[PDB]
């Protein structure tokens, strides 16, 4: 188990434009194309990203290509953020993957609202952090996923995913 497999489980793979759980245009393995309601806008973002005239459908290799880029951008976003980096540096490999997961899904911004939990994490107060993390719209909207992530942080093992 690694970050790639873990995210591929949480997000799934779709080769045709689809609406995420917030209703946004997405494709592949969790790649958000646009928060806009326009499907054309989406198709356009799509073409821009793939580098071709897709007509809303991509191949598996293209999806994987988006996915690598996206995971990479997530880490770097972490490394770049002054409040996150130190939290992330303080943790073990598994727990880092759990933070990447959250940044992938919600963006640096989204993840930046978990200030309190993150302090707890820094101090390695696992169970408390887990409960704090659960008092969130995040958990209330995508509970099974949130749960897997949370356990992961609580436990430091890949059990929730095996
Ligand atoms: Cl892109
Ligand atoms: Cl879920």
UniProtKB/Swiss-Prot annotation:
pH-activity profile: Optimum pH is 7.3.
Record note on what altering residue 117 to V does: 50-fold decrease in enzymatic activity
Residues at which substrate binds: 32, 104, 117, 132
Induction comment: Expressed late in the viral replication.
Location(s) in or outside the cell: Host cytoplasm
Recorded consequence of changing residue 20 to E/Q: Loss of 99% of enzymatic activity
Consequence the record notes for mutating residue 30 to F: Almost complete loss of enzymatic activity. The enzyme is destabilized by 1.5 kcal/mol
Substrates-to-products reaction catalysed: Hydrolysis of (1->4)-beta-linkages between N-acetylmuramic acid and N-acetyl-D-glucosamine residues in a peptidoglycan and between N-acetyl-D-glucosamine residues in chitodextrins
Pfam families registered for this protein in UniProt: Phage_lysozyme (PF00959)
Outcome (variant: residue 26 to E): Complete loss of activity at neutral pH; covalently bound substrate
Key words of the record: Antimicrobial, Bacteriolytic enzyme, Cytolysis, Glycosidase, Host cell lysis by virus, Host cytoplasm, Hydrolase, Viral release from host cell
One Gene Ontology biological process: defense response to bacterium
Function description: Endolysin with lysozyme activity that degrades host peptidoglycans and participates with the holin and spanin proteins in the sequential events which lead to the programmed host cell lysis releasing the mature viral particles. Once the holin has permeabilized the host cell membrane, the endolysin can reach the periplasm and break down the peptidoglycan layer.
Record-stated family: Belongs to the glycosyl hydrolase 24 family.
Descriptive protein name: Endolysin
Source lineage: Viruses, Duplodnaviria, Heunggongvirae, Uroviricota, Caudoviricetes
Gene assigned in the entry: E
